[PDB]
């Protein structure tokens, strides 16, 4: 899907998922301190395969 | 079912040309050509003789017996031979009647 | 390039069918059944190889204790009588002796006693 090219799986030099954090951003929040300020990166070594098979070609 | 279509439906002889028989049976045996059929490539020559028996059940006095008749052949004949042996003839000319051509080999007698 | 299965199945089959020699009924004449018969047979041919030994050994044993009792002993005493002395180590074929040559087997019995008590 084209909603994948704009999904947090960028084709990095190596070939893994360039994730982020889905804890809480837009709604349902207001507690904790810097829980929302967790707008960093994320990575996984068990789904890189069944995710890159949809965006690999159009890197 | 084909039958003489392999050839072009043209016989290289007539119904009165002395012809010999090469290969098969009756080797070297010459005879006068009687009935010639360009379709089924059939050739009746007084040479090959076959004693057949006509079936006449009630023609009146059938007296069924074994008559003397001839049998037809295929392309196992060398038409027109003048050196006493099988020849071939494609050369052509004209005599007094330029409306018809002729045939020859190494001699010119057909 | 189509490829028929001609001449291939028949042969396959005849190969099986010809194995059936003494097979009763359709086992010897029909394939689906003759072939099926063999599977069970395979289970027999192999297991029988291993089992036949259990049969003959058993056979030889009866002859041995039959000839023993003939004099006044028994298989348990006789075989052991050859063990007490590393001398005799026959065991196999020994059954043939107690059957063809009773004289030769008589000495082995007497020797069993002289190395026991």
């Amino acid at each position: 899907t084209h909603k994948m090219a704009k999904r947090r799986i960028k084709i990095t030099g190596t070939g893994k998922v360039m994730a982020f954090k889905s804890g809480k951003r837009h709604q349902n929040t207001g507690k904790s301190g810097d829980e929302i300020r967790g707008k960093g990166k994320g990575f996984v070594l068990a789904k890189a395969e069944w995710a890159r098979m949809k965006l690999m070609l159009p890197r | 079912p084909s039958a003489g279509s392999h050839h072009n439906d043209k016989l290289h002889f007539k119904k009165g040309d002395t012809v010999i028989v090469l290969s098969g049976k009756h080797k070297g045996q010459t005879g006068k050509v009687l009935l010639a059929l360009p379709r089924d490539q059939k050739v009746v020559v007084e040479g090959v003789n076959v004693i057949t028996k006509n079936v006449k059940p009630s023609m009146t006095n059938p007296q069924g017996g074994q008559e003397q008749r001839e049998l037809a052949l295929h392309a196992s004949k060398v038409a027109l031979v003048d050196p006493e042996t099988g020849k071939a003839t494609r050369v052509r000319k004209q005599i007094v009647d330029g409306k018809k051509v002729r045939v020859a080999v190494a001699s010119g007698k057909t | 390039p189509r490829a028929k299965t001609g001449i291939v199945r028949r042969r396959r089959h005849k190969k099986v069918l010809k194995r059936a020699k003494g097979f009763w009924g359709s086992r010897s004449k029909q394939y689906r059944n003759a072939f099926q018969t063999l599977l069970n047979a395979a289970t027999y041919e192999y297991r029988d190889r291993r089992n036949k030994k259990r049969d003959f050994r058993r056979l030889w044993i009866q002859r041995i204790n039959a000839g023993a009792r003939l004099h006044g002993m028994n298989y348990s005493t006789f075989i052991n009588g050859l063990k007490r002395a590393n001398i005799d180590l026959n065991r196999k074929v020994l059954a043939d002796i107690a059957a063809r040559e009773p004289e030769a087997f008589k000495a082995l019995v007497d020797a069993s006693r002289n190395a026991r008590q």
Binding site: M4, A5, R8, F20, S22, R25, K47, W50 | - | -
Partner: protein
């Protein structure tokens, strides 16, 4: 000869056949017969549920011309904008960018479309002049 001509050893292995099994059954035992729409994508498995909106732009992508390509080897063929094609930078449709990576001071002239801070301060530092379009 033409009949002695063999094969690579491993140039092409035999196909795989699921018939004549003698103990072979194709696929999974159940719920796998003559259907192919399951896929391996969808949108209820990680695909969706990822917090990403971003913004697609794709403006101008410049051609990375490594500095060692100019320096090191070569007798200076004059980069210009045509002769450089033979220097293994054939791209077209996009402009040209000059980035410093190889280091061997040498005096060479450079005519690329655009160039970096460190690039320009590495060419004229050893001789040359980085020409940019007016």
């Amino acid at each position: 000869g033409s009949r002695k001509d063999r094969k690579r050893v491993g140039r092409g292995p035999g196909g795989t056949d699921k018939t004549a099994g003698r103990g072979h059954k194709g696929q999974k035992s159940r719920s796998g017969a003559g259907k192919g729409a399951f896929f391996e994508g969808g949108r209820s498995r990680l695909i969706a549920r990822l917090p990403k909106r971003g913004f697609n732009n794709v403006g101008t992508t410049y051609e990375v011309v490594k500095l060692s390509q100019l320096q090191d080897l070569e007798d200076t063929t004059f980069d210009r904008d045509t002769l450089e094609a033979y220097r293994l930078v054939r791209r077209k449709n996009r402009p040209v960018k000059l980035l410093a990576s190889g280091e061997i001071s040498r005096a060479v002239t450079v005519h690329v479309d655009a160039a970096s801070a460190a690039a320009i301060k590495a060419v004229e530092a050893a001789g040359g002049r980085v020409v940019l379009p007016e």
